[PDB]
Symmetry: C3
Subunit: 137 residues, 3 copies
């Protein structure tokens, strides 16, 4: 995970334990996420990631449970070289305060497949088929 810090308030990502899935992402700014609203939180970070992954901006559990916070968007492509902004949603009834250095998300390097697309004129099945939504219930 290659990381270039873009200002002096940016914080280098790091996983909080050796079995942690994600790298902590901190705000490099003072801002607020409005109640029942969204805001983009600047991190001051540029990143370059390994082949065969994308970086997912994932939620921190404590902020979800305690402040009704989620990340929105969050699909950071391998070819993305701009500043990472964390899109926060606040579903709660009161503003969420963000200050410099505060951890606001966690970056997970999801392994993915990016094969060619093949258009076909029919597809077979398994047993499960158009097995929709509540396929079993």
């Amino acid at each position: 995970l290659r990381v270039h810090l873009l200002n002096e308030h940016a914080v280098l990502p790091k996983r909080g334990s050796a079995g942690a899935a994600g790298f902590d992402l901190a705000s490099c700014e003072d801002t607020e996420v409005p109640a029942r609203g969204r805001a983009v939180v600047k991190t001051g970070l540029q990143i370059a990631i390994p082949p065969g992954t994308y970086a997912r901006v994932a939620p921190r559990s404590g902020l979800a449970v305690k402040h009704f916070i989620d990340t929105g968007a969050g699909v950071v492509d391998e070819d993305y070289r701009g500043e990472v902004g964390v899109v926060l949603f606040n579903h709660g009834e009161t503003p969420f305060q963000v200050r410099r250095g505060d951890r606001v998300a966690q970056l997970i390097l999801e392994r993915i497949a990016t094969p060619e697309v093949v258009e076909v004129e029919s597809l077979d099945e398994t047993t499960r088929g158009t097995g929709g939504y509540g396929s079993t219930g």
Copy 2:
């Protein structure tokens, strides 16, 4: 990524750049996502995916930032052979308009492990344990 188009308004998925994580998913219909509400957007697409993955219906960043849009649900199994419908959530205060051909999500082929389940009568730890929510804070 094998794709069968189910009507003439469906659009073949394609990644927008060579380092893109996801394949663009377009609506094959005119519909609306109500304010503070949800709608399923038909894509007119059937898919078959590679072994060891699932297809995640992921959000587009622009729609999240600019229209408070998210995907809901979005776990498309390997054995799913029905029409892919994109579940959109609109957390904003005004309807989100969708028209035919509009890109509404992106499909990411997430690599996953699907081993057998093993029930045990105890589990050891690391240092981190029942380290809950804000494990460090």
Copy 3:
């Protein structure tokens, strides 16, 4: 996927089909997710997962479409040995009822990369660069 059941109302995870991406997670308790609100649903489960993954608490499609339900948080680390609680968000206008044995989420073992962090003083590009949000539109 190693699983220790913590009480007699807990349910062993299992995938609902052989091509299913996720292992079903059931509530071990009677509770409610308030309208436009959140609740943590206890599962009575401890888990240990394979190397190179994390367990994602993912939404069930039927609950999203039919009850406007999502999972929040949901990043369960490899070193997590506490009881898995499922964070549910209810964006709908009415309480969501949960009873013992009810399936409330699905656990997906996402493959991820967890390399060292490398801080750099510049990053090159592709064509796509600071290609932001709606990079193409």
